[PDB]
């Protein structure tokens, strides 16, 4: 019903993963990168328990590493 900061991060990563398979490495770079921005912002403003903080921190860091590989892939090609 209502779109939140954390909800947008989950959809941003889903659109990137699907795009990557559709030869949309370029789009995936912007999608994955955008998701990481919403994740970090969610932690800074909306700070939850250690469980949530660590969960989100681990998600953003994991996505950041993937988005970096997509750039080198499209850049090289």
UniProtKB/Swiss-Prot annotation:
| List of residues that carry N6-acetyllysine | 8
Where expressed (tissues)? Answer: Ubiquitously expressed.
Q: Where is the MIT domain?
A: 2-77
Q: Where in the cell is it found?
A: Late endosome membrane; Midbody; Cytoplasm, Cytoskeleton, Spindle
Resulting phenotype, residue 64 to D: Modestly reduces interaction with CHMP6
What mutagenesis or variant effect is reported for residue 64 to A/D? Abolishes interaction with CHMP1B; diminishes interaction with IST1
Q: State the residue spans of region: Interaction with CHMP1B.
A: 1-77
Outcome when changing residue 28 to V: In CIMDAG; uncertain significance
> Which residue spans adopt a coiled-coil conformation according to this UniProt entry?
none
Domain free text = The MIT domain serves as an adapter for ESCRT-III proteins. It forms an asymmetric three-helix bundle that binds amphipathic MIM (MIT interacting motif) helices along the groove between MIT helices 2 and 3 present in a subset of ESCRT-III proteins thus establishing the canonical MIM-MIT interaction. In an extended conformation along the groove between helices 1 and 3, also binds to a type-2 MIT interacting motif (MIM2).
What is its biological role? Involved in late steps of the endosomal multivesicular bodies (MVB) pathway. Recognizes membrane-associated ESCRT-III assemblies and catalyzes their disassembly, possibly in combination with membrane fission. Redistributes the ESCRT-III components to the cytoplasm for further rounds of MVB sorting. MVBs contain intraluminal vesicles (ILVs) that are generated by invagination and scission from the limiting membrane of the endosome and mostly are delivered to lysosomes enabling degradation of membrane proteins, such as stimulated growth factor receptors, lysosomal enzymes and lipids.
What is the disease in the record? CIMDAG syndrome: An autosomal dominant syndrome characterized by global developmental delay, severely impaired intellectual development, poor or absent speech, microcephaly, growth retardation, poor motor skills with inability to walk, hypotonia and spasticity, and cataracts. Cerebral and cerebellar atrophy, thin corpus callosum, and delayed myelination are apparent on brain imaging. Affected individuals show hematologic abnormalities mostly consistent with congenital dyserythropoietic anemia.
**What interactions and quaternary structure are annotated?**
Proposed to be monomeric or homodimeric in nucleotide-free form and to oligomerize upon binding to ATP to form two stacked hexameric or heptameric rings with a central pore through which ESCRT-III substrates are translocated in an ATP-dependent manner. Interacts with CHMP1A, CHMP1B, CHMP2A, CHMP2B, CHMP3, CHMP4A, CHMP4B, CHMP4C and CHMP6. Interacts with VPS4B; the interaction suggests a heteromeric assembly with VPS4B. Interacts with SPAST. Interacts with IST1. Interacts with ZFYVE19/ANCHR; leading to retain it at midbody.
Protein name, please?
Vacuolar protein sorting-associated protein 4A
Q: Which organism is it from?
A: Homo sapiens
Q: Write the gene name.
A: VPS4A
From which residue to which, out of the full length, is covered?
Answer: 1 to 77 of 437
């Amino acid at each position: 019903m209502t779109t939140s900061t954390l909800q947008k991060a989950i959809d941003l990563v889903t659109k990137a993963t699907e795009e990557d398979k559709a030869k949309n490495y370029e789009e995936a770079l912007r999608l994955y990168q955008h998701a990481v921005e919403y994740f970090l912002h969610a932690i800074k403003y909306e700070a939850h328990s250690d469980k949530a903080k660590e969960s989100i921190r681990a998600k953003c860091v994991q996505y950041l590493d993937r988005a970096e590989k997509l750039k080198d892939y499209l850049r090289s090609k």
